Amino acid sequence: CLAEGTRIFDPVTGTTHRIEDVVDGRKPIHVVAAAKDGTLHARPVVSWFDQGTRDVIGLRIAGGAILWATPDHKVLTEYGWRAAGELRKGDRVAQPRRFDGFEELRYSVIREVLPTRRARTFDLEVEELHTLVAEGVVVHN
Amino acid sequence: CLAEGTRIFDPVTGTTHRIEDVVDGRKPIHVVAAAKDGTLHARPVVSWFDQGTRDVIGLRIAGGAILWATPDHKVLTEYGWRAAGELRKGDRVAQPRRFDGFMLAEELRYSVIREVLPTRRARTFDLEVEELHTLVAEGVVVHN
Ligand SMILES: [Zn+2]
Ligand SMILES: [Zn+2]
């Protein structure tokens, strides 16, 4: 599950949403989803889940992003899908390359793993691809 | 997460595996996976997860199979994904079946839940299925 505050970009509208707002309002937004080959595609959210308050850990990525998710949340890495709790400094996660062009994914090293924290968590179902970019990182849905 | 003992059907070999054996041996078995349009395909397991001991509930499906999963595990229904813990007796779940006369040949069919069993503690596991992110466990299409 992803923590409250997680930013999700809707490529069809240009709006960046906070996951808790998407779930609380059952907003049918589109997200940046990753296909098996690494290409990105806009896919609609079809299910919304308020997963309650749970423990989450943080992955500070080279570049500035800090992904907060439960230890069992799956993240796309250089070695495929791995649980956030299994990752450590040095491991690389998948991130979309800048949309302005200045092929579509890049792997960034985890700067540091942050200690467990209590937070409201959520989940979304993304049609067909079951993935989405959250806090600048390709994560599992 | 799925409980120890969960039977996973490999449509390629025809073999049925216990999920804990698949995870403990990181076996790249194939599973019956459902695509967006409901069609079924053989897809390989690419990741294995030992999720530790968690609370799991049980759903006995028409036919006799019993799916033991955490209440938050997503199950495929004609209305989309639903948390196992929200399903009740009589609700229908996706259960692939081959033509009996009464891309894979299996057709996506639906079967009713005959009984909901009380929560219990059990070792749990999870699997990642290439591309489609779904698989058949205890004959029911569940979320991966
Ligand atoms: Zn999904
Ligand atoms: Zn998956």
Side-chain angles (χ1 to χ4, degrees), chain A residues 59-116:
Chain A
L59 299 184
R60 185 189 296 291
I61 311 300
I66 295 181
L67 179 67
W68 289 99
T70 56
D72 57 10
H73 200 90
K74 288 166 288 197
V75 182
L76 184 60
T77 75
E78 58 188 315
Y79 300 160
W81 296 102
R82 309 299 132 186
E86 301 179 298
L87 305 177
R88 216 113 308 172
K89 298 186 182 63
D91 289 320
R92 295 180 295 177
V93 302
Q95 289 194 301
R97 291 180 178 288
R98 293 168 59 65
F99 293 168
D100 58 14
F102 294 75
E103 280 190 49
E104 298 173 54
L105 295 173
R106 71 168 186 291
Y107 291 92
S108 303
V109 182
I110 291 174
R111 189 69 165 59
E112 71 170 300
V113 175
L114 293 298
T116 305

Side-chain angles (χ1 to χ4, degrees), chain A residues 123-126 129-131 140, chain B residues 74 81 133 143:
Chain A
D123 235 302
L124 300 168
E125 274 311 303
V126 176
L129 303 182
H130 291 274
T131 63
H140 193 281
Chain B
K74 286 78 172 308
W81 299 101
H133 291 280
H143 188 274

Side-chain angles (χ1 to χ4, degrees), chain A residues 13-33:
Chain A
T13 71
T15 294
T16 290
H17 303 266
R18 256 58 182 173
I19 193 167
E20 65 265 36
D21 293 331
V22 179
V23 176
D24 290 340
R26 298 292 194 285
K27 307 187 183 184
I29 67 168
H30 281 80
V31 304
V32 178

Side-chain angles (χ1 to χ4, degrees), chain B residues 13-25:
Chain B
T13 61
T15 298
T16 298
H17 301 81
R18 293 188 309 171
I19 194 162
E20 66 270 20
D21 298 333
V22 178
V23 171
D24 297 329

